[PDB]
Structure 1
Amino acid sequence: RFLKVKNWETDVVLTDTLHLKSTLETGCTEHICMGSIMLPSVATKDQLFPLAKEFLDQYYSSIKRFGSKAHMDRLEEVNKEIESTSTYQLKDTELIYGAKHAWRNASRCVGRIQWSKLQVFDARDCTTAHGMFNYICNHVKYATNKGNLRSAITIFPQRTDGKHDFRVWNSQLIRYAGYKQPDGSTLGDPANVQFTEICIQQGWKAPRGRFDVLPLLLQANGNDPELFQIPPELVLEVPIRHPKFDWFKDLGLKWYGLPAVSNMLLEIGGLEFSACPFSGWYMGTEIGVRDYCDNSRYNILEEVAKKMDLDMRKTSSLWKDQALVEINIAVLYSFQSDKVTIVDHHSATESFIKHMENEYRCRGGCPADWVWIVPPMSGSITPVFHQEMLNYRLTPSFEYQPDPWNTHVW
């Protein structure tokens, strides 16, 4: 009931008691571990108050006023609001706490050493897609900060009945389009082929190229979603060059500076925020390994190995690995030479171990998803490979949610 996690590169042992506070379930059982399943699986007033109480008890505990008078009155006040409306409203402070701790609690996120320095934009007064556009533009501008990127989240009104959701239909605020071709190939980002055509369905005039920034498809208060184009000046992009290979620029690769996930759901005290785009900055491998080198993505190991004049005749020449390192040196170099925030997988994984020690010390644990924390290349030469991690579900939290076009009564 007081579990131990060991680091086998350092022989460091941390004791986890925070998992005792875990509420949700993991997918694993006593007889089957589901740690590698990608996705693991209306709210009534009866279920709502325990969740509110739990949250308010940790909120008031954190500001060193647990059991104080303001706590009991707020507990009473939220119960009375749940009785009347079968829901309730968070104070601005409780909203900022919840979002920060949802990030703190995101076990798949290696970037959490920064969780307390999160900028919370309260967009709960928003009523229209245009207002969402406005809020999102201000989010992008603020988080981008001329390349000195800043963590931020914009929180649209919470789900109520269920038929009146706010959704950003983009999976990220800034993504490149993906078009299939006559010959069945894929121009741009294959990940977004369906979403690109959804925008073309709703009326997007596509500039059928590679790195075309998709429009925003914004649904407000359950209404049908509406297209908006982010001002190009707000979309900071990095052309990818290599510090040695001058042909690398001829690849014409570029990526956007700001990673901003917009398809997740934020849970705070049983309240559900279906539109809560959050942004930080990139770990280099996200672009250089996954985005560029996944087979089902841009898939450029082919061309880079060619230009490096690599032995591509069999697997065992490791030409794939060799080109993968050059690509990631190029992403990091390009971002840093442009003063656009980025972190290499070595710095970020070391920071995550330091983060883990802090959390185990000043919190009794740190839920962590090894499958997702270990970077997609160079696993074992980073310290997280050798770090045992306990995964468990704490709340406030970020949850997955269906794509809105699969669920929306149209």
Structure 2
Amino acid sequence: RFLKVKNWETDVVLTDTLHLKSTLETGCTEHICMGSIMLPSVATKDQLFPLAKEFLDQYYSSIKRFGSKAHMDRLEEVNKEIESTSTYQLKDTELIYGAKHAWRNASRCVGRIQWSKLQVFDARDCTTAHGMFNYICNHVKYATNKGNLRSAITIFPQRTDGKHDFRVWNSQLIRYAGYKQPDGSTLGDPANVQFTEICIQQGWKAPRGRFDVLPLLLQANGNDPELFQIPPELVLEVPIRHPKFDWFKDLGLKWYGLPAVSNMLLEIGGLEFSACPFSGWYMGTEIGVRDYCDNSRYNILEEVAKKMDLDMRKTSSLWKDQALVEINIAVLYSFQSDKVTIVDHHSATESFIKHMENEYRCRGGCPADWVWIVPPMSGSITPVFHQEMLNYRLTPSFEYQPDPWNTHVWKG
């Protein structure tokens, strides 16, 4: 009823009561745990009012006006609007609160110490794909802020019936293109080979190289999506160099500064925002480990090991491990030397522990997904490795949604 999580490096115990407010389901049961499953598995008007009331009661509890006159009138005001319209509209203040607590509740995010410093851009007056492009461009410019990255979200109109959906078809606002070859291999980013081809289908002309920034595929109000090129002056990039190995520039690697997710769904008070691109700043490992060294991504451990002169015959020479660390010292160094905000996995995981402490103190808990919080290298030398974490689903939240090209009723 009042569960306990322990840290096995400091012996610190914390008591979780926030999980009692949890509502959605995890996928786990009393007899099977699905904590390593990546994605465990129209809305009517009856279901909407409890979700609205639940959300309204915590918004007014947060401005220290729980159950007052202003609360009960907005309760009544939203009920009458759900009767009238079968849906409702958030105030600007409720949207900013909802968006900030979707991030706060994001159990897979190690960066949440920053959750209250989120800049929310209301794009609910948008009606066309061009309007979307303009809003997204202003998001990219604001969030980048000349390399002093600022976290932000842009929120396009909520879902209504279902066949009128705003969607960003890119999985991230800024991604590199992936082209397969006649000889079967892959240039660029293999993750986006499918999306890179959809752009070619709709008319993109590819500069078939490595780090080619993809165009935006924007869908407005259910209509077929349309292509727009982000002005290249708006795409900040960092060339990767090493502070010891001057052969590292010869590798000719670079990465974009802005991590900006655009394929998830924002849920606030039962309303569904199918297009809500949000952005922060990178933790180093996301680029240096997953992006650069996944076998099905850029997969550069091969070459970094070569140029270091390493024993690549035997698996147990740990040459993969040894090249992995050099690559991540270089991503960090390059970003910092250009004053482009980045955080190392040691500082980021310390901050999360400190954030976890604050949450248990002033909130009664912190939903956290250990499988996703522990970084993909040097896990046990970071403090989150030794921290027990309870995972549960609170709302407002960010959720996964199917890719648009599997679900969109086309019209030629």
Aligned to 1:344: 344
Structure 1 residue ranges (4+ consecutive) displaced by more than 6 angstroms after TM superposition: none
Aligned to 2:80: 80
Give 1:154 shift.
Answer: 0.2
Aligned to 1:3: 3
Give distance in 1, aligned partners of 2:385 and 2:203.
Answer: 46
Give distance in 2, aligned partners of 1:39 and 1:242.
Answer: 37
Give distance in 2, aligned partners of 1:29 and 1:67.
Answer: 36
Give distance in 1, aligned partners of 2:315 and 2:382.
Answer: 24
Matched residue of 1:46: which SS?
coil
**Structure 1 residues not aligned, in runs of 5+:** none
Give distance in 1, aligned partners of 2:220 and 2:50.
Answer: 29
Give distance in 1, aligned partners of 2:400 and 2:113.
Answer: 22
Give distance in 1, aligned partners of 2:377 and 2:334.
Answer: 19
Aligned to 2:55: 55
Give 1:132 shift.
Answer: 0.3
Matched residue of 1:388: which SS?
coil
Give 1:199 shift.
Answer: 0.3
- List aligned pairs for 1:40-189, cutoff 5 A: 40-189=40-189
Deviations 1:260-317 (A, max 9, x none): 0000000000000000000000000000000000000000000000000011001100
Identity across aligned pairs (percent)? 100
Give 1:395 shift.
Answer: 0.2
Matched residue of 2:179: which SS?
strand
Matched residue of 1:146: which SS?
helix
Give 1:41 shift.
Answer: 1.3
Matched residue of 1:135: which SS?
helix
Deviations 1:53-106 (A, max 9, x none): 000000000000000000000000000000011100000000000000000000
Deviations 1:139-176 (A, max 9, x none): 00000000000000000000000000000000000000
Give distance in 2, aligned partners of 1:249 and 1:180.
Answer: 25
Give distance in 2, aligned partners of 1:198 and 1:51.
Answer: 37
Aligned to 1:232: 232
Give distance in 1, aligned partners of 2:320 and 2:293.
Answer: 9
Give 1:386 shift.
Answer: 0.1
Give 1:40 shift.
Answer: 1.4
Give 1:137 shift.
Answer: 0.3
Give 1:373 shift.
Answer: 0.1
Deviations 1:104-157 (A, max 9, x none): 000000000000000000000000000000000000000000000000000000
Matched residue of 1:285: which SS?
helix
Deviations 1:200-248 (A, max 9, x none): 0000000000000000000000000000000000000000000000000
- List aligned pairs for 1:293-372, cutoff 5 A: 293-372=293-372
Give distance in 1, aligned partners of 2:39 and 2:344.
Answer: 26
Matched residue of 2:238: which SS?
strand
Give distance in 1, aligned partners of 2:408 and 2:60.
Answer: 37
Give distance in 1, aligned partners of 2:319 and 2:279.
Answer: 34
Aligned to 2:275: 275
Deviations 1:333-368 (A, max 9, x none): 000000000000000000000000000000000000
Give distance in 1, aligned partners of 2:84 and 2:299.
Answer: 55
Give 1:324 shift.
Answer: 0.2
Give distance in 2, aligned partners of 1:72 and 1:117.
Answer: 29
TM-score, length of structure 1 as denominator length: 1.00
Give distance in 1, aligned partners of 2:135 and 2:120.
Answer: 12
